[PDB]
Design a protein around this ligand. Sequence first.
Ligand SMILES: NC(=O)C1=CN([C@@H]2O[C@H](COP(=O)(O)OP(=O)(O)OC[C@H]3O[C@@H](n4cnc5c(N)ncnc54)[C@H](OP(=O)(O)O)[C@@H]3O)[C@@H](O)[C@H]2O)C=CC1
Length: 294
Amino acid sequence: RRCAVVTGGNKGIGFEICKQLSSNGIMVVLTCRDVTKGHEAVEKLKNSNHENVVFHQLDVTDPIATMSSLADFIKTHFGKLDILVNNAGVAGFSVDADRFKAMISDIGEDSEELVKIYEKPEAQELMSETYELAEECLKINYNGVKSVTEVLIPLLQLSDSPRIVNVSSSTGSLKYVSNETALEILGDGDALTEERIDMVVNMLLKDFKENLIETNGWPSFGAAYTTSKACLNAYTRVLANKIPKFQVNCVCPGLVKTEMNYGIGNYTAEEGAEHVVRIALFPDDGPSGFFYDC
Ligand SMILES: NC(=O)C1=CN([C@@H]2O[C@H](COP(=O)(O)OP(=O)(O)OC[C@H]3O[C@@H](n4cnc5c(N)ncnc54)[C@H](OP(=O)(O)O)[C@@H]3O)[C@@H](O)[C@H]2O)C=CC1
């Protein structure tokens, strides 16, 4: 049996990825940071007749040394890893829940309008981004992906067909990278390295902390998130180059109705996960280094 690790597996797209991989005969290690939430998710899938799922704790921001226990667990019970889905991620902003629920109620969750207004200024007024949230966003969406990937690479090396799928967003496209220095680094594909991508991340965090978002031409809203995904894409390309044995790709699942969006989206969680699972289960002869649907 092929086996998979999915990060952020307790809810949203991640939970549905675990369910669908399991449905396709994959042995799934559902990981997430909250132990109670993890056990409840696995119990829920079992009660749905998905038996090839097991829980293991994983907060992607923890030290890489702590992750050694996941690596050992997989080696001991499975002998290899075939699939890693880097799904865990956060938006980098909070919302006024009361007013957001009022806005959703008012419009009606349907009529493309709800999705339309979610992107209007009327909506941003209900959202708050802070340096604290930015720092966490980058640690989870970018650095966390690097740590989990580094720890599990030696197990993926043992697979005859290793795959890494990183869940990205189209807002991470270079078209939205406004800062000139960042655009220059991320757009110079031939010169991409992990170190240069780290520079972009550190540049953003430094400017954010020093209140230079507007001043240095960063996006006026959602700069942490969009930067984290643009850096995730670049890192995905670098990793693809470094490890030609692997399939390493990003997938942008479209706008999905999860708690990340307070239920707003074009696709259900099931549908979003389907988009990611189609790449995770590519034939053994598959491409690497690309950004699907981004
Ligand atoms: N929903 C959308 O429209 C889109 C989502 N994406 C990407 O899809 C991925 C999943 O998003 P989605 O399902 O919508 O969001 P959800 O908020 O519903 O789920 C997020 C998952 O990530 C977990 N998570 C958050 N921080 C950490 C951490 N430090 N360590 C381990 N797990 C963590 C959450 O755990 P917990 O329950 O403990 O908080 C949860 O399991 C993300 O990378 C997101 O950026 C890309 C394009 C569109």
